[PDB]
Design a protein around this ligand. Structure first.
Ligand SMILES: [Fe+3]
Ligand SMILES: [Fe+3]
Ligand SMILES: [Fe+3]
Ligand SMILES: [Fe+3]
Lengths: 198, 198, 198, 198
């Protein structure tokens, strides 16, 4: 069926003071909803093109599909990766997986922090699992859909688009990237990891 | 372990006359091998950065990782999607899946053909499965890693980079895009689809 | 010599209420300054590479050069295109140039408004002059350096990166794109145009 | 008026054996002509949108305009930068300009060679003049329109898209990048430079 805006598992102001409730409400209710609507529209426009047998706008359609679907995919994961009862460090299989792939938790954190804070434009930092070579890798994503391979399964993501922190941290993106550690939902990341290696 | 260049399941000239053996040997033995080496190098450079605690080149490293890993992922699938005993049309669950998602096999073929022939630069046409909305979608990929969402599982891909057809078809990319139908390995696409919906 | 942060021709709060003084001070003193420093650094890193005869980081260097130099170029023009004693409509040669290239001033405004409000990520709307075909064209620029040809001379630009309006207009980018008309410095655009056609 | 395919100042096979006549004829008569037609079409589609007051396809239109106009601009310069009576080294003001901006002619050549051979996809190496900081810089351009600032004036360009060398050099792009030095038309580069600093 249609793409739908997911409900949050917590109240908008539940992440304060790391992420303000004013940001969570605009981010959720305005930005995310838009990508949901844009993905729904792109799918519909592609159905119409097929019906009318006219693909003169294929480049635009495939671009709208990709951009909005990725916005949609990315924020859906973001809301799940976040929690009021979060923070701390990972435990168990993930904790071992991460120390083995990055050296240590701290070494993973510094690479993820550098990937998140050096984007030249809108982007995200992403922890994903490569099915091909069976490794945990960090990716720096441009906008929502560029700079990563096909078939990677996302585990943890950090939204580095300006709207994610501007009202609260203004231009100091590093402070925002550091506060994030406090609200990560490791239960969720652990779960995704289990699925990905299954 | 390391990324490795896969072996082909057929002789280089087994796809003639649709794809020449001269192209398959350069494509496999030179282009693909390079991406394999580049992915192996990027992984190694990221290990070194972690060791020396220096991420001043993070943007370059994450870009090399993404580009080569995607080149690697993309060609690995390409070789499997191809066969001497191929062509014809899909059968069974896939055949029904495709008619249901695109209208008909022919309607799917025209959209894939338009996506493949309208790239403005290097790119590919890709048939993938969206886990989020549980739909089969076509994506137009730029280079190897741009213009699609995270977590999509690739089913069929058509290499539209110039090196894929230049020696044989020269600038007539449409003739190459049409000959491709003759060598598609539907057994492989079917298999990927089963896995993806499992 | 070195790239330098230009001085404004007006006080930070001189554009209120269309653009808040709080935005002008962060935008100028923090964002722009950064691009100035990044361009200065890239030029220096390229000199070092030449000296040590090592271009293993050429892709990174050319990317840093391009991104920061463009950020620098773009904001430098932005500050000049803005004025407290601005707004209204163009007059003279430009006014005729624009009606001739776009139909009418209003038709130019609607295209520029659509280009500015539909970017999928960070970007700008840009009015430039094509030396090759001697025409005035509108370009939609991605980030600071993508999606336009070489040798185009920029006349008017509208900053659509989130930091340009977020604190004041939040997600309502269209209201920001509409307020801009009130502070455009047509004297400046006219001047650039004369130079470009000279 | 309309964009038009320029005539060459030499016969297609005049650059042998560095660049084959078979490549020059496909490159000129097929690839370039296409960009000319695409630019002419984009300009026309934008006029229609203005007339019908409908900019629902603005993103596509501005992308087609940019891509084809840049293809057009880039190849037009390429044909001029090439000559049968070329090669050797620059002389006079340019020769001094280049040694001053890069160290030496050889140091300029190695950077340009690295920029040309490391593109990850279609691209070009470009020698341009920055009006803002009054410096000669090298840019690595992605496709035809990305990765450089507005207002730069192009002086020398090297086409690194596969179609530029594939038939002759196959995957050995470095040999092609080295043969180019033999056919550069320094008279042309000198001329552009004079204009740019005027
Ligand atoms: Fe966001
Ligand atoms: Fe290929
Ligand atoms: Fe800005
Ligand atoms: Fe070319």
């Amino acid at each position: 069926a249609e793409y739908t805006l997911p409900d949050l598992d917590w109240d908008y102001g539940a992440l304060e003071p790391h992420i303000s409730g004013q940001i969570n409400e605009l981010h959720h209710s305005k930005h995310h909803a838009t990508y949901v609507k844009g993905a729904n529209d792109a799918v519909a426009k592609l159905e119409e093109a097929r019906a009318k047998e006219d693909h003169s706008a294929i480049l635009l359609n495939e671009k709208n599909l990709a951009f909005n679907l990725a916005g949609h995919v990315n924020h859906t994961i973001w809301w799940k990766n976040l929690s009021p009862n979060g923070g701390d460090k990972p435990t168990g299989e993930l904790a071992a997986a991460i120390a083995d792939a990055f050296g240590s938790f701290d070494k993973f954190r510094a690479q993820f922090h550098a990937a998140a804070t050096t984007v030249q434009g809108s982007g995200w930092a992403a922890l994903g699992w490569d099915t091909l070579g069976n490794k945990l890798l960090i990716f720096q994503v441009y906008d929502h859909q560029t700079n990563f391979p096909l078939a990677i399964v996302p585990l943890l993501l950090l939204d580095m688009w300006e709207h994610a922190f501007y009202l609260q941290y203004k231009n100091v993106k590093v402070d925002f990237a550091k506060a994030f550690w406090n609200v990560v939902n490791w239960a969720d990341v652990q779960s995704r990891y289990a699925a990905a290696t299954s």
